[PDB]
Every structure is written in structure tokens, then in C-alpha cells.
Amino acid sequence: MDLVKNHLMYAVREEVEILKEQIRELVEKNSQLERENTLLKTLASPEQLEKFQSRLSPEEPAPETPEAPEAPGGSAV
Amino acid sequence: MDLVKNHLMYAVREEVEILKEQIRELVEKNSQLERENTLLKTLASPEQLEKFQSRLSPEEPAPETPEAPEAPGGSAV
């Protein structure tokens, strides 16, 4: 027989049908998440937020941090 | 591409490492696509998580759970 060891793209029956459908579903889920992420990346690329950056509106100063020095470390440096 | 089963004597590649590395790279790439797609889904579409706090995970489903006896669904309306 030489066809079973040929249509492995139909199943590559030889390792595990579950891991084969898992890698096929991981590549199909990654491709669907790559197009879904690229679709939301392009949709949120131009204008689809409430302005915050320097392109739409400059705001949201500093990252998630308070306005006071309260970190531990008497002489760590 | 029909090449790993050629030098296999030189090592015998194809063990469960080629399937664990394929599912690990597929889950690591899908994971980066899930953290980037989730951050892009909440950035472009922030209205999909208010459900709770407002900064952790947009989703969390809910089966037939009990609600408060009044009219609304606990915190809403």
C-alpha cells in the first residue's frame, strides 16, 4: 500500500487522531484568531475608541500608578 | 515536509516532542493571539465586560443562577 502513507494531509494517521485534530483546530483557531485579531487591530487602528493617545486625543497621563512615593526599600540601591 | 522521516536514523525525530512542540507553539501563538485579541477587543470594544469590576476578563458566562428577589438582575437597570 502506498496511499495510506500519502494522504496524511487527510489525517496523517500514524500519531494520534486527537492530537492531529488538536493541531488542526489549533491552527484553525489560531488562523481564525489571527484574522479576528487583525480585524480588531485594523478596526481599532484608525478611529474606534474614545480618544486617549496622541493621534486622537492626548490624555491618560502616566501608566496605572498613584501620585505618591510609597515603595519599600530603605537602601536597596 | 516528508523530510523528518528521512534522517530519523540520525536521531529518530518524530517522538512525542514534535507533537508537544507543535501543540506548545500552537498554544503559545494562540495564547499570544488571545492576550492581544482580548486586549484589542477590550480596547476597541470596552463594552463587553462591565459585567464585573472593569479590568480583568471580558466573558465569564453564567448558567441558571439565582438572582435577587426584586425585579432587576442584582446590579443593573
UniProtKB/Swiss-Prot annotation, chains A, B:
Phosphoserine PTM positions read S45
Q: What is this protein called?
A: TSC22 domain family protein 3
Report one GO cellular component. cytoplasm
Read off the domain note. The leucine-zipper is involved in homodimerization.
* Classification via InterPro entries: TSC22/Bun (IPR000580), TSC22/BUN_CS (IPR047862)
Induction line: By glucocorticoids in lymphoid cells and upon IL4, IL10, IL13 or glucocorticoid treatment in monocyte/macrophage cells. Transiently induced by IL2 deprivation in T-cells. Expression is up-regulated by synthetic glucocorticoid dexamethasone in differentiating myoblasts.
* Provenance organism: Sus scrofa
The subunit structure is: Can form homodimers, however it is likely to function as a monomer. Interacts with AP1 and NFKB1. Interacts with MYOD1. Interacts with HDAC1; this interaction affects HDAC1 activity on MYOG promoter and thus inhibits MYOD1 transcriptional activity.
Q: Where does the source fall among the domains of life?
A: Eukaryota
Listed Pfam families: TSC22
Q: Which family does it belong to?
A: Belongs to the TSC-22/Dip/Bun family.
Q: Where is this region: Disordered?
A: 41-77
- Protein location: Cytoplasm; Nucleus
* CDD domains, A to Z: ZIP_TSC22D3
Q: Where is this region: Leucine-zipper?
A: 19-40
Q: Which residues carry this modification: N-acetylmethionine?
A: M1
The processes (GO biological process) annotated in the record are: regulation of transcription by RNA polymerase II
Question: Mostly located where?
Answer: cytoplasm
This protein's encoding gene: TSC22D3
Q: Quote the biased-composition stretches of kind Low complexity, using this chain's numbering.
A: 68-77
- Record's function text: Protects T-cells from IL2 deprivation-induced apoptosis through the inhibition of FOXO3A transcriptional activity that leads to the down-regulation of the pro-apoptotic factor BCL2L11. In macrophages, plays a role in the anti-inflammatory and immunosuppressive effects of glucocorticoids and IL10. In T-cells, inhibits anti-CD3-induced NFKB1 nuclear translocation. In vitro, suppresses AP1 and NFKB1 DNA-binding activities.
**Keyword terms of this UniProt record:** Acetylation, Cytoplasm, Nucleus, Phosphoprotein
